[PDB]
Nucleic acid binder design. Structure first.
Ligand SMILES: Nc1ncnc2c1ncn2[C@@H]1O[C@H](COP(=O)(O)CP(=O)(O)OP(=O)(O)O)[C@@H](O)[C@H]1O
Ligand SMILES: [Zn+2]
Ligand SMILES: [Zn+2]
Ligand SMILES: [Zn+2]
Lengths: 334, 64, 49, 267, 213, 97, 111, 236
RNA sequence: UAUCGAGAGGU
DNA sequence: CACTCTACCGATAAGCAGAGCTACCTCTCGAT
DNA sequence: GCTCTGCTTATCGGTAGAGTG
């Protein structure tokens, strides 16, 4: 591969099965080649042993960890990012009506992939900002929604239950005094249904969906998309409501100068993406592209009403060229 | 002070788009939708948090 | 001599820690207690070197 | 780091006690600076009090609204700023005249307390409390957050004519208010200086700005022991002041000139 | 007590206006210039101690020397207004007084502000000139500062002599803004030049010229 | 050296330790050699110097360019004046001497 | 200290009974009202000390990162405790130490 | 101990490009389901069963950033969880973090956590072992043999409770001795050798771990420098 | 004897 | 002759977008 | 990705004057 400027890569085959529901009222298909990291478990060099390493012109001091793409040895650089699924509280600059913000990036456990990001902002500066209330940010909603409103839209409506999820100390009068503006700014929303509708009326979607579904659209933005690392099945809003209160609690501990703001550079709050996660994020993008090419091919080849041979609807160049391109140029994407 | 706002909503009757005007009187908690074309009017209660999309939503449910 | 003089400078820093922790430390104008503490500790350690 | 250099009249500059008097009069002190805590009680009888601490105070004093505003002053900060309970209550009176009944305890009391009442009113007292801490100025020049007492060694000729040193007291501030501090009796109004040459330009004019600009640049260069010949810095400060206003060494200054377009577009 | 600082500051603003007038070339008697604070209080305050601004107004004429040098120097009217906020009503009576008595320049000291509407009555009164000062801004005479060297207005003849010596157009001299504190103190008008003699650490003395915008 | 861990500079110290050794005093000389704590603390100060050199070089380089463009056309003329390309007088005599 | 309505669980707001001249805590979503035990309605602390000691838990002696001292406990007179400066994260916070005896778990000072 | 303090490029990338220290590792990722099962088996109560009035002293428990339960005796819970990891019952790369002050117990099976190994010091005051290294010349003997007395290498030490991995978050809660000699107090005055810190702020130290060797804070490149402890740090 | 980029480096 | 009731220009911020970010030098590598 | 300044939009009064009782 080095000598002849070839790519050292393994063919990947995937079983595919067709089915045709009809109501009057395949096998080992090749999807692309994946470049193999030398001396890994999937490299033809992992066995052999010094005798045959020398016969393969391989140096026993070469420990691998790199790929061969068009003859060139490419190494992946560990990519540093912030940890997912952790709450961090930061302070905001002076010329802003917001003074403290809590943030969390939600990411699933399987695959490990980002999903969405959410914020809870405390408005009102120091003796500036009038009403000092607290609004949240929801995925796919155009405007910040006061905290009390989203608590009610989740099934906890009386003031006393909402505050029992946030403040865990009936004696803490400083924190309770700081929650005052949030209650009064969410006074007119006195039940779950008008809460869910208050949300749905800003979350993009279509114009003119009546209360009967624009609620049911907001019920989706809460079940999925909102803190999806907690759960995405229905009827588990008890886990999400308690977490929302935890965030607000953490937000206020810092605003009361009882706790320092989080240190974005603390290495324990950081993660390094190596070959696996880096390849997986790219393979996900490219396999969806292959997926869309399969769907687009059925709509032309099925208008003929001819049994499609599948292997004629999978161009393995989509995955093979995508992976080759990113490893060859260093541009990690399409 | 009253708020006179133009919107990009479609009138439910005459179907002219970008011709619904919303007048929100918060001092008396009374919101008013008006059509700049066919001239109809719809009234509904508003709170302090409401916006032209809140009463236009109430107008869709008042018809159906 | 060098090792002795550094040892005595470390002791002065102990005294300064004691005063600041027993509310017996002079506050310099325009400075919080902790700023004044760090300033006194810094002058002591730089003079030791 | 905004800062004023406040030279004092000679009689004050050689008497540390008189210089301290100028110091305490210049430093800005708000009501928020001396207040430790504020409270709002429901004390319905104006001539008595549910507060056991202020019992003997109001009973003897008497020999309006039921809501009480009770604020406590911190003894340490009241001592540092050199403020008496009387004058703190006086300043409150002046801004609230007859719309507020003010009652203050003596400086000998265990807690320093000021009681206030208006002459639905639960919220009106919170609005008043916010306005008081945020606007009431007890003394000093606004913008002067701290005043330091600095000793100057100034070389002045003898009676024999020989130059000898002479120690004189002056003041230096955090924050600036050159115009107001110049007017303060005691301050040598012919020498007061500010390290904001923008402020010098508004108070003293362009030729004074020229000198102040040079002084501030020289201070930067000379600090690490360096030395640049006068004519180079003089040339730069004349360029920055030739238009009659301060031309910044940025495109917003430089390219506001009537110079050719080819020259200006090459920057 | 606190009433004494009001009288003192007003007396200091008053001394500055006289100083300003003297430097601009007008004649002020050496008895009114040296007027103590006590004499000021006796003449200006009521029995209750409150001062009457309308009693502070005065008129002055150029000295013979100043009139020989500057032939554009007329009669000057200085008036302190008893009304803190000077509105369109107050300014009109002042502009009428200036034209009727045909003063060349009138200096109007206000207390708190001048409304922008009344401020437009200022350029409608030519060839007479109205200048405004906030009474605060005059408590200290800024030209007495170490950093402000002596500015001296050039005569029309002296200016021409300067331009020819350097073969200069007017736009090639260094400038001083009309609103410059020292330009306002001298009442500089567009086109007039000040000469400024200045300490120099390389030559001892250096003459700087600026022309008024 | 700041408490980059919770109330301490390194996991080798107890919390709330303000002693010389806890916050970066290097007692040893280069002859004797630095301890592991001193080594790291010295490398923290040293990194800051490499960062400063890499950063502030562009800060002052832009400053010098703006200074040059502000002043590039200013010349001493045969009448002794210092002028720009418009013939405006910047100084009536260079350096006042 | 503000309380909650016994029938609606929403928070009670202070309201005067003008005729009897007494402080009540009334609800705002229903007709419930109750008598106030405390005349104080509002407090604002500028110079605060809340959160000074903060997390003193039964297992604070198990945190091996805390320094240990010999100071004699006022309660049980044990010669073994852990200490820490104020947990208030303000810039003007004092540096005076809080000690926690590992025996009786009392929080004392060196005053 | 996680990235090299010396090896970083000069110039624009300075401090942004880093290099793994010699003993660093990166977490591969581990399933959380076995962690949940152990927590519920040893006393964790669900969040639907939870009231702050009833749980005014209990510890909140997080697993990969989701609040999953509360436990009333956290001191026993963490010791149990830690001992499962020190034997291999839990994957050694899992993070076990007790924040005692904040009453929080956090567990991470996340991929991408940077960790390093340390010697375990016996911390239980119920045995003469306490205060000393758990590792003995017997472990060192079996390491040199390659086999146990009924392969024995690095991971054998990790699953026999004498060495464990800690990441940056768990490192926040431990007390590390710099060398084995620092585990015990001493009686020097040799003017040639270097001065060791006094450590006189705490009367008695309770070490939980000990560094294997402090030179392992360096990466590949800086490990080539002879006597880097005698150089001005930029030269390294 | 190409062009557009990227990356790693030198003082 | 005492009142409001609205058409003015101040003086506000006020929000915003973009403009700019040391000098010179080496080499390899991929895409068009 | 971060600092600055200038330029283009809302808010603020502020009067300043006819309509008024
Ligand atoms: N990134 C950069 N940008 C601009 N100029 C640079 C530069 N890096 C180096 N230089 C030039 O090279 C000089 C650096 O010289 P070096 O050899 O790097 C250090 P020194 O200060 O001369 O010696 P030392 O090694 O004894 O400390 C700078 O002063 C400058 O002249
Ligand atoms: Zn219509
Ligand atoms: Zn109720
Ligand atoms: Zn005890």
């Amino acid at each position: 591969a080095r000598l002849r400027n070839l790519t050292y890569s393994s063919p990947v085959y995937l079983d595919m099965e067709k089915s045709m529901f009809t109501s009057i009222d395949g096998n080992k298909v090749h999807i692309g080649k994946v470049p193999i990291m030398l001396r890994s478990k999937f490299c033809s060099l992992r066995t052999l042993d010094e005798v045959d390493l020398y016969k393969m012109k391989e140096c026993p001091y070469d420990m691998g960890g790199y790929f061969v793409i068009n003859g060139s040895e490419k190494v992946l650089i560990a990519q540093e990012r912030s940890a997912a699924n952790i709450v961090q509280v930061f302070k905001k600059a002076a010329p802003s009506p917001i003074s403290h913000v809590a943030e969390i990036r939600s990411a699933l456990e399987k695959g490990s992939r980002l999903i969405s990001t959410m914020q809870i902002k405390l408005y009102g500066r120091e003796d500036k900002g009038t009403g000092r209330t607290i609004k949240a940010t929801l995925p796919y909603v155009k405007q910040d929604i006061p905290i009390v409103i989203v608590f009610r839209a989740l099934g906890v409506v009386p003031d006393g239950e909402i505050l029992q999820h946030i403040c865990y100390d009936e004696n803490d009068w400083q924190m309770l005094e700081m929650l005052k503006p949030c209650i009064e700014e969410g006074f007119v929303i006195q039940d779950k249904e008008v809460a869910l509708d208050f949300i749905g009326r800003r979350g993009s979607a279509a114009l003119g969906i009546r209360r009967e579904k624009r609620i049911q659209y907001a019920k989706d933005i809460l079940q999925k998309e909102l803190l999806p690392h907690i759960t995405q099945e229905e009827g588990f809003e008890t886990r999400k409501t308690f977490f929302l209160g935890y965030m607000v609690n953490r937000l206020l501990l810092c605003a009361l100068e009882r706790k320092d703001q989080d240190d974005r550079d603390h290495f324990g709050k950081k993660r390094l993406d190596l070959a696996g996660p880096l390849l997986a994020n790219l393979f996900r993008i490219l396999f969806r592209k292959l997926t869309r090419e399969i769907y687009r091919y059925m709509q032309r080849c099925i208008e003929t009403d001819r049994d499609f041979n599948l292997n004629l609807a999978v161009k393995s160049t989509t995955i093979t060229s995508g992976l080759k391109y990113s490893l060859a140029t260093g541009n990690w994407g399409e | 002070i009253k708020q006179k706002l133009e919107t990009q909503f479609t009138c439910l009757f005459c179907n002219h788009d970008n011709s619904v005007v919303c007048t929100l009187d918060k001092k008396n908690s009374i919101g008013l939708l008006e059509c700049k074309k066919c001239g109809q009017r719809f009234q509904a209660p508003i709170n302090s948090l409401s916006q032209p999309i809140d009463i236009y939503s109430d107008w869709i449910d008042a018809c159906e | 001599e060098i090792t002795h003089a550094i040892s005595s400078a470390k002791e002065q820093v102990q005294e300064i820690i004691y005063k600041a922790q027993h509310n017996e430390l002079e506050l310099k104008p325009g400075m919080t207690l902790r700023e004044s503490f760090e300033g006194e500790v810094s002058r002591t350690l730089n003079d030791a070197r | 780091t905004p800062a004023l250099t406040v030279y004092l009249d000679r009689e004050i500059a050689l008497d540390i006690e008189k210089a301290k008097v100028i110091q305490s009069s210049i430093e800005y002190t708000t009501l928020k600076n001396v207040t430790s805590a504020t409270e709002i009680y429901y004390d319905p009888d104006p001539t008595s009090t549910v507060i056991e601490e202020d019992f003997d105070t109001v009973e003897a004093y008497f020999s309006q609204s039921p809501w009480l505003l009770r604020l406590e002053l911190d003894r340490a900060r009241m001592l540092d700023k050199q403020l008496t309970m009387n004058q703190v209550a006086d300043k409150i009176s002046e801004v609230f005249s007859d719309d507020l009944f003010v009652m203050w305890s003596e400086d000998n009391a265990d807690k320093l307390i000021i009681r206030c009442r208006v002459i639905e009113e639960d919220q009106m007292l919170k609005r008043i409390e916010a306005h008081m801490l945020d606007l009431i100025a007890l003394r000093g020049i606004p913008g002067i957050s701290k005043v330091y007492m600095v000793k100057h060694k100034v070389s002045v000729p003898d009676e024999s004519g020989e130059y000898k040193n002479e120690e004189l007291w002056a003041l230096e501030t955090d924050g600036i208010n050159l115009a107001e501090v110049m007017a303060v009796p005691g301050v040598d109004s012919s020498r007061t200086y500010s390290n904001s040459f923008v402020e010098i330009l508004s108070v003293l004019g362009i030729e004074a700005t020229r000198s102040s600009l040079y002084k501030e640049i020289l201070n930067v260069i000379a600090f690490d022991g360096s030395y640049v010949n006068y004519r180079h810095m003089a040339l730069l400060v004349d360029v920055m002041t030739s238009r009659g206003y301060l031309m910044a060494i940025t495109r917003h200054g430089i390219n506001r000139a009537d110079t050719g377009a080819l020259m200006r577009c090459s920057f | 007590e606190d009433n004494n600082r009001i009288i003192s500051r007003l007396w200091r603003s008053f001394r500055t206006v006289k100083e300003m007038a003297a430097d601009r070339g007008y004649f002020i008697s050496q008895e009114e210039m040296d007027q103590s604070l006590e004499e000021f209080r006796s003449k200006i305050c009521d029995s209750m101690g409150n001062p009457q601004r309308k009693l502070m107004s005065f008129l002055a004429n150029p000295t013979p020397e100043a009139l020989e040098k500057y032939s554009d120097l007329g009669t000057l009217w200085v008036e302190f207004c008893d009304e803190p906020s000077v509105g369109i009503k107050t300014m009109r009576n002042f502009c009428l007084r200036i034209q009727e008595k045909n003063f060349s320049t009138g200096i109007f000291i206000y207390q708190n502000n001048i409304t922008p509407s009344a401020n437009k009555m200022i350029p409608t009164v030519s060839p007479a000139i109205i200048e405004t000062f906030q009474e605060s801004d005059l408590v200290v005479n800024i030209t007495h500062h170490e950093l402000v060297p002596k500015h001296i207005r050039l005569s029309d003849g002296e200016k021409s002599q300067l331009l020819q010596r350097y073969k200069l157009k007017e736009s090639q001299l260094p400038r001083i803004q009309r609103e410059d504190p020292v330009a306002r103190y001298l009442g500089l008008k567009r086109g007039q030049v000040v000469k400024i003699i200045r300490r120099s650490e390389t030559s001892g003395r250096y003459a700087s010229y600026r022309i008024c915008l | 050296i700041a408490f980059g861990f919770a109330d301490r500079s390194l996991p080798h110290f107890t919390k709330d330790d303000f002693s010389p050794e806890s916050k970066g005093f290097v007692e040893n000389s280069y002859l004797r050699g630095l301890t592991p704590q001193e080594f790291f603390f010295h490398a923290m100060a040293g990194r800051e110097g490499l960062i400063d050199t890499a950063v502030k070089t562009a800060e002052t380089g832009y400053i010098q360019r703006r200074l040059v463009k502000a002043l590039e056309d200013i010349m001493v003329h045969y009448d002794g004046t210092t002028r720009n390309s418009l013939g405006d007088i910047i100084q009536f005599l260079y350096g006042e001497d | 200290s503000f309380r909650f309505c016994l029938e609606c669980n929403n928070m009670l707001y202070p309201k005067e009974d003008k005729e009897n001249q007494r402080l009540l805590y009334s609800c705002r979503n229903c007709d419930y009202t109750e008598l106030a035990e405390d005349p104080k309605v509002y407090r604002h602390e500028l110079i605060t000390n809340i959160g000074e000691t903060a997390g003193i838990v039964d297992d604070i002696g198990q945190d091996p990162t805390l320094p240990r001292s010999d100071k004699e406990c006022p309660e049980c007179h044990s010669r073994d405790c852990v200490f820490f400066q104020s947990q208030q994260r303000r810039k003007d916070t004092n540096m005076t130490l809080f000690y926690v005896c590992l025996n009786c778990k009392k929080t004392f000072r060196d005053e | 101990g996680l990235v090299c303090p010396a090896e970083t490029p000069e110039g624009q990338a300075c401090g942004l490009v880093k290099n793994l220290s010699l003993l660093s590792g990166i977490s591969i990722g581990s399933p959380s389901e076995p962690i949940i099962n152990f927590l519920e088996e040893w006393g964790m109560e669900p969040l639907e069963d939870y009231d702050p009035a009833q749980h005014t002293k209990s510890t909140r428990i997080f697993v990969n950033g989701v609040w999953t339960g509360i436990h009333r005796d956290p001191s026993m819970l963490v010791s149990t969880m830690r001992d499962l990891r020190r034997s291999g019952a839990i994957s050694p790369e899992v993070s076990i973090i007790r924040d005692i002050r904040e009453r929080e117990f956090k567990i991470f099976t996340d991929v991408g956590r940077v960790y390093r190994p340390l010697f375990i010091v016996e911390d239980d005051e119920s045995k003469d072992n306490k205060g000393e290294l758990r590792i003995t010349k017997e472990h060192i003997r079996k390491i040199q043999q390659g086999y146990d007395d009924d392969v024995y290498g690095w991971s054998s030490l990790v699953t026999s409770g004498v060495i464990e991995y800690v990441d940056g978050e768990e490192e926040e809660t431990i007390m590390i001795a710099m060398t084995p000699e620092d585990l015990q107090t001493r009686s020097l005055n040799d003017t040639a050798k270097r001065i060791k810190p006094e450590m006189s702020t705490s009367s008695h130290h309770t070490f939980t771990h000990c560094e294997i060797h402090p030179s392992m804070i360096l990466g590949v490149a800086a490990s080539i420098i002879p006597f880097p402890d005698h150089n001005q740090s930029p030269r390294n």
